[PDB]
Amino acid sequence: GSVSKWVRLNVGGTYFLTTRQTLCRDPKSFLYRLCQADPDLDSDKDETGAYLIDRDPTYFGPVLNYLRHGKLVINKDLAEEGVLEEAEFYNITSLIKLVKDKIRERDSKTSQVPVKHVYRVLQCQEEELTQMVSTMSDGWKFEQLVSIGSSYNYGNEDQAEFLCVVSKELHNTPYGTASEPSEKAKILQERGSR
Template identity: 75%
Template sequence: SSNMASSPRTDDHIVNGEVSGTARSREWIRLNVGGTYFLTTRTTLCRDPNSFLCRLVQEDPELNTDMDETGAYLIDRDPTYFGPVLNYLRHGKLVVNKDLAEEGILEEAEFYNITELIRLVKERISQRDNRPPKAGKKHMYRVLQCHENELTQLVSTMSDGWKFEQLINIGSQYSYGSEDHTEFLCVVSREYSSSSGSNQCSTDRPDHLDLHSSKDCRKLNFMYNLPASP
């Protein structure tokens, strides 16, 4: 905040064992990482005493330390990946935004020489790379030829897992009693795992479609598979 960046008063002193003013203001550190400002404490940055950041704020003579016009330490690194590094120093946990790559955080951890964070990121990468792939999902499609008076019954009696996709009017008409009826093609689909085994019971098989409608609604003698949409 602006108060933290302001110059300390000349009458700073210790009250009841607590340091006020100048000494306390020195605890707060301002960093300019790739043009983005971060405000944190000296204690946080020195969580790993051998890290670049701790050496920086301790003004290690072996480091070439530059500051901008606001008094912030200049660090020419990607600010996007500095966030997870700073948060680790704050609470000791590796929290990775889903939009960030672990390899990017590893690069920063190695640059700042934060030993434990390097270990955590490498462990996370190893877990990610060795995670078994998810079972692929596919869609099974069935096409049924039905009369219009069968449509309601068809939809209400489909087996669990099957869903209605499309209704196509094929235009042919025939006389049934004293009424004319239009025929339709009804497309239904079901998602299933590509690892589905042959030992599944009939009602769990991806190609099983249980219909309780009358003989006027019949399955056409073909089907086809398409991969699931990404």
């Protein structure tokens, strides 16, 4: 309708039956000027009064969620690049900023160093080996086992027989590195170095 409590928008030929206030959520949106009844409007469905807009119903959805519940959530089948495109087209500056931040974190993860693996050197003699490999902690991956030559007993029968390098991934790069200052920790680290 031309004027009503509820609005019947037509995105890409698909009707969205929403409320005026969802579109009137913010006044820096393309949809706000779309909602207003003023000169320079000739693109509408003149058979029902629906505003026929040439925009994709794909990326309009996540954007419409932003004005419907304050947040934009992208689909698993819609690129956050596409929703950034749509937000920039509709000039929702706050939405542009938030989608840019999400894309920044995603690209920091994907471009390189999605994770920063941590590595540990377990030292196991042959007897216990299998068990502590079997009971090796959840979330850790075996990476290497190396024997060591010894004059105590070369090859087999050694209590420092095997050095097992294990590792696990760490999500600290997409979230950012964390550190806080403390002088006692630093002096203890200096003690440990010597």
